[PDB]
Amino acid sequence: VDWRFFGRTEPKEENKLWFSDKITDAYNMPQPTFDFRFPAGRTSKEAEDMMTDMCVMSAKIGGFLPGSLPQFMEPGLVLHLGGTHRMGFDEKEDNCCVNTDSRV
């Protein structure tokens, strides 16, 4: 049995996806670059509590399979990236890009 637990990450202004003005990708478009860390308080404390929960819960079923021991996966392997063009009611108050009709 596979066990995959997925944490929630607080949105923080400093966590960014930006694009190079000099380096280009394979289609000749501005190269994506990340400036990302998991925020240090709730997100981090929940992430480790989440690991603990997986270890506790999975043990009710069976022990770990050697070679597939409990681990964090490489950041972003999960492919659930959000908030890069985020929604809210007000561009300024809600620090956002599109409204609730998804209109820019």
Ligand X SMILES: Cc1cc2c(cc1C)N(S(=O)(=O)O)[C@@H]1C(=O)NC(=O)N=C1N2C[C@H](O)[C@H](O)[C@H](O)COP(=O)(O)OP(=O)(O)OC[C@H]1O[C@@H](n2cnc3c(N)ncnc32)[C@H](O)[C@@H]1O
State the virtual CA torsion across 49, 57, 66, 6 in degrees, nearest 10: -50
Told to check if 32 binds a second copy by CB under 8 A, we report yes
Element (H, E) at 63: none
Number of Cβ within a 10 Å radius of residue 72 = 12
To a second copy, the closest distance from the beta carbon of 9 in angstroms equals 9
Binding mask 30-69 for ligand X (x = CB under 6 A): ----------------------------------------
**Could you tell which of a second copy, ligand X, none binds residue 11, using a CB distance below 5 to 8 A set by kind?**
none
**Nearest CA among 51, 39, 43 for reference residue 13:** 39
To a second copy, the closest distance from the beta carbon of 48 in angstroms equals 4
Residues that bind ligand X (CB under 6 A): 78-80
